[PDB]
Design a protein around this ligand. Structure first.
Ligand SMILES: CCCCCCCCCCCCCCCCCC(=O)OC[C@H](COP(=O)(O)OCCN)OC(=O)CCCCCCCCCCCCCCCCC
Ligand SMILES: CCCCCCCCCCCCCCCCCC(=O)OC[C@H](COP(=O)(O)OCCN)OC(=O)CCCCCCCCCCCCCCCCC
Ligand code: SF4
Lengths: 298, 158, 166, 100, 101
């Protein structure tokens, strides 16, 4: 029956996308570090290493935090359209689903800090959680500029609305705020370590530490792909196939995240919160207001 | 749509039952987050897509984060487990059961043509919110400003 | 060869030797020459003089490390105490923790450290360890010593450059 | 295909569970947790009622309800922090001296 | 219910269960295999995040129906955002959003 092979082909496309995203996150752990088997080497090194949960800790919360740090942004990828006919879930909510996963992602840091029976790791986790809340508070509006221009929450509709002018030009402030918010919500440089406060990844070892790392790089994949989809026309290109254009733009943004890590220095903690709130939230509110006035005038 | 509704309702009921009886605060908050996720799934089963997205974004993603933050900074009655022995919850449990049975007696006997499950999108909710609901929106911003002022006045350290 | 107390065993040995996360513990003037938490580390590079006051620190940071654990001693101090046969110096880090690879020198070169890394990868790849803990005995290979393996090429050396050149 | 009666009964079950959790606990934190349960159940009932009629008003009342829930959770946790920092004890029965 | 929408529902469900199962199997293989041998500013920041997140939800609902709301809706959102910015300014000047005094 054509219906069964159609649904099986769609399921195979979704599984292929998921495997490509996971392997891309691991391969860019290597790329942030020729040696193609080096990733496999650390993979089975952490796989075969013994695991140590602290004795006076909470087992369920400690085990649960890396699962959140992986699956949150891994599930957030599912709205991204790669090419015509290659989407996983063409949701009506779309970018709302990305906001849902980004909201659930903070529990990984909080849970790791509490379950790690250590006051320093707990303090570091509270600091990192305050930081990521301070940037999650305007992530959604930085995407609302694009939503307001497109008039829908769908991603394919946004890409089709980018058919002539990419939203990097009119939503350049939305571009900038979503770039900073995507970097800060992923807890990477220059928002990598805000820490009497030590890291919340201490007492984590082996495969849980591997989960934290691969979840961070999977989040980088998801953020760069959504970056391309929202602000750079998605798959639209004159000559190359749409899959190829999406791949080059996603790689472009992924090595630019790597370059920002390798180049930019780390601001202070209070400086990070002050910049986040005081600059980026009123800037994004003003950007959405001006966007609404522009589209209503036309 | 009925399948997801019934499993999510059952998960929400079970998670709430673990919430109100548990002793560890972080565990109780985790069960509460699970119940909120289930309630969002119920909202998605009904077609209220905006409500489910808001149940994850605002309830589980903001309010429970605040509760979790407060519990972590407390570093926390627990030892005796008063609420477990039947001589404490003998009264309130049957009181809530009587209230529940009266309420569900009122529920049974109304016009019920069923829920279609047609998705009421967030765009239509926005048109309604910024059409015939101007004063609800402005005074809800006003109310949230009031709550912000109160919570800063009470909760600051000095 | 002799062992002191299967394809996937070769796989885990290959992965362990091809990705080593070191924890360089620099006690003294070997540290400047050789230039991650111990819970996330698997190799301890002990470089420097092992003082009596800092020996509990070394022992504690070795105990905090998780299995599998390998130790590389850099320099004469970590090997045997070196030139400091004195009241305040422990005569070698192998007095209290087991050492996998020793490097002579004072200080050794960084390329000597890289050669010892090759030796450590060879010893890891030539070892058999308990795969899953559900025989729980660590079997380390009694490798042929480097001085007998390289004896022929060393003894065959006849002429060297005179010390009057740079 | 889903009955309105079943959704209303589910909301009632969660409401009475929140109420008994509010009553039986001496710790103020679990009282606030039960209050959050009750208000979430009321918002769920409004969503069920709005979705039954095919109206947007249920989700609008849901939005107002969760705005109220956010503000009340903020204020209640501020009061709990004040109680803990002034008494070092979250027992609500100790806050009982006004009587008569 | 078209064939495409149920195909996408199946694909989304498979995406969910494969991702969760991959993470759980990853941790299961990690555990099973191997060899055994605070200040009130945090509450205030989280509270501000909650309040401004609810205001953000109102702005989310406005943004998706701009062409169906007209200039009246722009005015409505204008007083909404003005009150939001007034509250943000209030928090900034009173030192509420000041981590370092
Ligand atoms: C640790 C585990 C925790 C629990 C994890 C989840 C448990 C359940 C896993 C199995 C889920 C199976 C899939 C369920 C159905 C998916 C499809 C679906 O929801 O379709 C309904 C709706 C379709 O709408 P649309 O396509 O936009 O419009 C056309 C309408 N025919 O589309 C929607 O309504 C889409 C919006 C809902 C999508 C929800 C996806 C999961 C969300 C929860 C993630 C939890 C992450 C882990 C925990 C975080 C920390 C607590
Ligand atoms: C499996 C047995 C139980 C095992 C343990 C529990 C696991 C989790 C169970 C709950 C979540 C999955 C429920 C099953 C969903 C399967 C998909 C489904 O039924 O989709 C129907 C519908 C599709 O949308 P619609 O266009 O309306 O289609 C109706 C007819 N065409 O879908 C919808 O309208 C909405 C789909 C559901 C909403 C999105 C997913 C919500 C997930 C909530 C997770 C809650 C926390 C779970 C914690 C687990 C541990 C305690
Ligand atoms: S071996 Fe020599 S160079 Fe190294 S720490 Fe000892 S004295 Fe210093």
């Amino acid at each position: 029956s054509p219906e069964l092979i159609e649904i099986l082909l769609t399921i195979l496309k979704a599984v292929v996308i998921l495997l490509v995203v996971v392997t891309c996150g691991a391969f860019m752990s290597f790329g942030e570090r020729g040696g193609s088997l080096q990733l496999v080497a650390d993979m089975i090194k952490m796989f075969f290493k013994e695991d140590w949960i602290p004795k006076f800790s909470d087992r369920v919360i400690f085990t649960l935090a890396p699962m959140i740090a992986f699956t949150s942004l891994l599930l957030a990828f599912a709205i991204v359209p790669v090419s015509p006919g290659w989407v996983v879930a063409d949701l009506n909510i779309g970018i709302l689903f990305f906001l849902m996963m980004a909201g659930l992602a903070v529990y990984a840091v909080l849970f790791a800090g509490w379950s790690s029976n250590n006051k320093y790791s707990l303090l570091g986790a509270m600091r990192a959680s305050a930081q990521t809340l301070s940037y999650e508070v305007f992530l959604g509006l930085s995407l609302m500029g694009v939503v307001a221009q497109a008039g829908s929450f769908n991603m394919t509709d946004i890409v089709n609305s980018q058919a002539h002018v990419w939203n990097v030009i009119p939503q350049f402030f939305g571009f900038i705020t979503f770039a900073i918010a995507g970097v800060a919500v992923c807890h990477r440089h220059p928002f990598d370590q805000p820490e009497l406060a030590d890291g919340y990844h201490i007492e984590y070892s082996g495969m849980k530490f591997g989960l934290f790392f691969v979840g961070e790089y999977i989040g980088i994949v998801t953020i760069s792909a959504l970056m391309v989809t929202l602000f750079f026309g998605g798959w639209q290109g004159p000559l190359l196939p749409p899959f190829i254009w999406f791949a080059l733009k996603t790689a472009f943004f992924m090595m630019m995240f790597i370059l920002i890590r390798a180049s930019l220095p780390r601001p202070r903690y209070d400086q990070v919160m002050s910049f986040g709130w005081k600059i980026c939230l009123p800037l994004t509110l003003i950007n959405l207001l001006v966007t609404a006035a522009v589209i209503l005038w036309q | 749509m009925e399948f997801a509704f019934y499993i999510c309702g059952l998960i929400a009921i079970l998670a709430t039952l673990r919430v109100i009886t548990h002793t560890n605060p972080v565990h109780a908050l985790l069960y509460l987050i699970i119940s909120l996720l289930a309630i969002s799934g119920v909202f998605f089963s009904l077609g209220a897509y905006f409500a489910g997205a808001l149940e994850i974004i605002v309830y589980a993603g903001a309010i429970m984060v605040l509760f979790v933050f407060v519990v972590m900074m407390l570093n926390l009655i627990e030892q005796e487990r008063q609420w477990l022995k039947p001589q404490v919850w003998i009264g309130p449990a049957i009181l809530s059961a009587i209230m529940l049975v009266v309420i569900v007696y009122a529920i049974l006997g109304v016009n019920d043509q069923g829920i279609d499950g047609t998705p009421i999108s967030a765009k239509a909710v926005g048109i309604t919110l910024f059409g015939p609901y101007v004063l609800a929106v402005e005074l809800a911003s006003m109310l949230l400003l009031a709550g912000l002022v109160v919570a800063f006045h009470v909760g600051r350290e000095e | 060869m002799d062992y002191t107390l299967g394809k996937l065993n070769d796989m885990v040995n290959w992965g362990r030797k091809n990705s080593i996360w070191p924890y360089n513990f620099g006690l003294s003037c070997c540290y400047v020459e050789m230039v991650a938490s111990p819970r996330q580390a698997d190799l301890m590079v002990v470089a420097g003089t092992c003082f009596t006051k800092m020996a509990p620190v070394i022992q504690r940071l070795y105990d905090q490390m998780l299995e599998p654990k390998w130790v590389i001693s850099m320099g004469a101090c970590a090997n045997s105490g070196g030139m400091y046969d004195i009241y305040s110096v422990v005569q070698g880090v192998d007095k209290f923790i087991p050492v996998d690879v020793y490097i002579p020198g004072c200080p050794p070169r960084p390329e000597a450290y890289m050669q010892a890394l090759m030796l450590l990868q060879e010893s890891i790849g030539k070892e058999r360890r308990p795969l899953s803990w559900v025989d729980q005995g660590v079997y380390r290979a009694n490798m042929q010593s480097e001085r007998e393996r390289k004896r022929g090429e060393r003894i065959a050396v006849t002429n060297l450059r005179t010390p009057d050149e740079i | 295909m889903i009955p309105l009666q079943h959704g209303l009964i589910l909301a009632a079950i969660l409401f009475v569970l929140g109420l008994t959790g509010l009553v039986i606990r001496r710790n103020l934190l679990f009282m606030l947790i039960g209050l959050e349960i009750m208000i979430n159940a009321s918002a769920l009932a409004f969503v069920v009622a709005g979705s039954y009629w095919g109206q947007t008003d249920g989700q609008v009342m849901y939005i107002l309800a969760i705005s109220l829930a956010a503000a009340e959770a903020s204020i209640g946790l501020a009061l709990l922090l004040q109680l803990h920092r002034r008494r070092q004890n979250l027992n609500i029965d100790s806050v009982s001296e006004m009587r008569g | 219910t078209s064939t495409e929408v149920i195909a996408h529902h199946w694909a989304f469900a498979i995406f969910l269960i494969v991702a969760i199962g991959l993470c759980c199997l990853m941790l299961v293989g990690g555990w099973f295999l191997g060899g055994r041998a605070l200040s009130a500013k945090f509450y205030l920041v989280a509270m501000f995040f909650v309040i401004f997140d609810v205001e953000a939800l109102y702005l989310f609902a406005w943004s998706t129906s701009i062409r169906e709301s007209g200039w009246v809706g722009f005015v409505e959102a204008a007083i909404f955002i003005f009150v939001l910015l007034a509250g943000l300014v209030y928090l900034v000047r009173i030192g509420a959003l000041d981590w370092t005094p």
